[PDB]
């Protein structure tokens, strides 16, 4: 699977993007600018079917 997806698991206001990036360092490269925008830079969940990561605050 490529097409790498986020979820901003945040305590105040959730979200999710998509990106091209094509492996994980690639895409946690992309997700991290996403959620240090959105104030959620915390944790970085890890996955192995879904490949989607998620913030945890």
Do not use: H, P, R, S
Request: net charge negative.
């Amino acid at each position: 699977m490529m097409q790498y997806k986020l979820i901003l698991n945040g305590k105040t206001l959730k979200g999710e993007t998509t990106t091209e990036a094509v492996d994980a360092a690639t895409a946690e490269k992309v997700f991290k600018q996403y959620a240090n925008d959105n104030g959620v830079d915390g944790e970085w969940t890890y996955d192995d079917a879904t490949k989607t990561f998620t913030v945890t605050e």
